[PDB]
Design a protein around this ligand. Structure first.
Ligand SMILES: Cc1ccc(S(=O)(=O)N2CCC[C@@H]2C(=O)O)cc1
Ligand SMILES: Cc1ccc(S(=O)(=O)N2CCC[C@@H]2C(=O)O)cc1
Ligand SMILES: Cc1ccc(S(=O)(=O)N2CCC[C@@H]2C(=O)O)cc1
Ligand SMILES: Cc1ccc(S(=O)(=O)N2CCC[C@@H]2C(=O)O)cc1
Lengths: 264, 264
């Protein structure tokens, strides 16, 4: 998409040489922001084929509050496999914080229900937020949240959402992070009887791995195609009752898929 | 400053009519980002005179972890007075989360010491974060954090910092929020033997109150002046040992002060 390609070129033009925790080098910038008007079309990268099967199941699993990967394994979704222990456990990652953030007094806070409540009854609120950044639980997590916190906003009948992503692999992860939150905006909007507004993406350490440089050059030689359209085939009674089959992407005509090797 | 005035004009040009919790109307945009290269000069607004006395004491008080306003009252700083109860208490706002975030198992997490530790021993980390957004404590706070979370980053000997501000009064609060975090970047950098990099400001609901419209027009008719220079007169042994008198702003030559009335 135009904003996505502009971000790739920016990291190439001004990223600084920086290694990750593993020791794999990257080019990196700090601080970036992009906006996707969801009424312009579903923001799924067209300059390389991006599959959404895993992303849809992942979002449903996050909304359920589950951090054990057996649901993902029931559907042969293996994107969390490398972090899961023998029992399939990941510790209190994303879903556990969204639905059951543990407090010092023994409560489990349901941030998704809180924000739906706020969107329906106090849409002008400036604190319609979900955070996965639960400082006391980070040590138990298989990994600290990369998409760490997000805020909703309502204006003129439209639902917008801003995500703060502390760390971003532009080539491999970003396309999927955008699609995931854009899907969630559509689902929340449907549940609140609102139209879709903007998805605002904000990045912290935003990088390209040095072994993705050829892939990045290839993708930058391709012209974005028209954005597809998300269709929600049914309207569930709540945000927790969406099913995989409810979603259909229409008119997606991407350039060919580009693989991304990763060091271990 | 140029970025600040551009943001004012943007809210005027495209903000949407939106009320706050009180019922005072605002013009509002959602999602904005600005960058201040701290090597270009200390980012204190010059198009209106901005005082930093309260801001400096406030930052020292935040770093101490104190949420009772008696220290502020010892120095005749009254900016938190309207939120404090009879004993001067505010609940577990900013400082309490920065220094002693309470966990479900009874620990109190010192996020400032954690991040200093990370900056000195693992500067490439992509998780050098402080969050004040402690979901289980929001109800006890006099008010939910507006400057809710911030991340540090190190590249080429320079310390940068990105703040996510969920709600921003562009006229009254923003000038001060920028200066506060810019001061903290200088102090953290000094303690880590690093040069200052960028302060990246990211906003969520970013607005102008409708009773600040004349003030905004007046300020937009003024040309920014050269930025001042921050001088730290002494190097304390730690980030908790800074004193009011350690800081001096040099070369600040602002246009006249502009008052901001507020409804109650
Ligand atoms: C009916 C049900 C849903 C989801 C879960 S869970 O384990 O995914 N999680 C989400 C809410 C609290 C619960 C738990 O961690 O115990 C348990 C039961
Ligand atoms: C196909 C695919 C989807 C999503 C991601 S990811 O990097 O955004 N994500 C999924 C696994 C854990 C990781 C994360 O959220 O940190 C990677 C690959
Ligand atoms: C020596 C000292 C510093 C600061 C405080 S405090 O009340 O401001 N606060 C900060 C760290 C934990 C402590 C408390 O809330 O008890 C108490 C004692
Ligand atoms: C002179 C002045 C400084 C700072 C602020 S503020 O809006 O950024 N701040 C200080 C009091 C509580 C409020 C806040 O951080 O939410 C307002 C006025």
């Amino acid at each position: 998409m135009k904003q996505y390609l502009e971000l790739m070129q920016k990291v190439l033009d001004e990223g600084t040489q920086k290694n990750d925790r593993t020791g794999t080098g990257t080019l990196s910038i700090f601080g970036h922001q992009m906006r996707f008007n969801l009424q312009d079309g579903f923001p799924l990268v067209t300059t390389k084929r991006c599959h959404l099967r895993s992303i849809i199941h992942e979002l449903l699993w996050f909304l359920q509050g589950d951090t054990n990967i057996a649901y993902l394994h029931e559907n042969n979704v293996t994107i969390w496999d490398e972090w899961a222990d023998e029992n399939g456990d990941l510790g209190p990652v994303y879903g556990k914080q969204w639905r059951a953030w543990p407090t010092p007094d023994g409560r489990h806070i349901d941030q998704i229900t809180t924000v739906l409540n706020q969107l329906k009854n106090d849409p002008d609120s400036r604190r319609i937020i979900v955070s996965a950044w639960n400082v006391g639980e980070l040590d138990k997590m298989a990994l600290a949240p990369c998409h760490a916190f997000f805020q909703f906003y309502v204006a003129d009948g439209k639902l917008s959402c801003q995500l703060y992503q502390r760390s971003c692999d532009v080539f491999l992860g970003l396309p999927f992070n955008i699609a995931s939150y854009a899907l969630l905006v559509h689902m929340m909007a449907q549940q609140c009887d609102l139209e879709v507004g903007d998805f605002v993406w904000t990045g912290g350490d935003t990088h390209l791995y040095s072994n993705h440089m050829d892939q990045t050059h290839l993708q930058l030689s391709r012209e974005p195609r028209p954005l597809p359209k998300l269709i929600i085939k049914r309207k569930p009674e709540s945000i927790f009752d969406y099913r995989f089959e409810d979603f259909e992407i229409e008119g997606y005509d991407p350039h060919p898929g580009i693989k991304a090797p990763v060091a271990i």
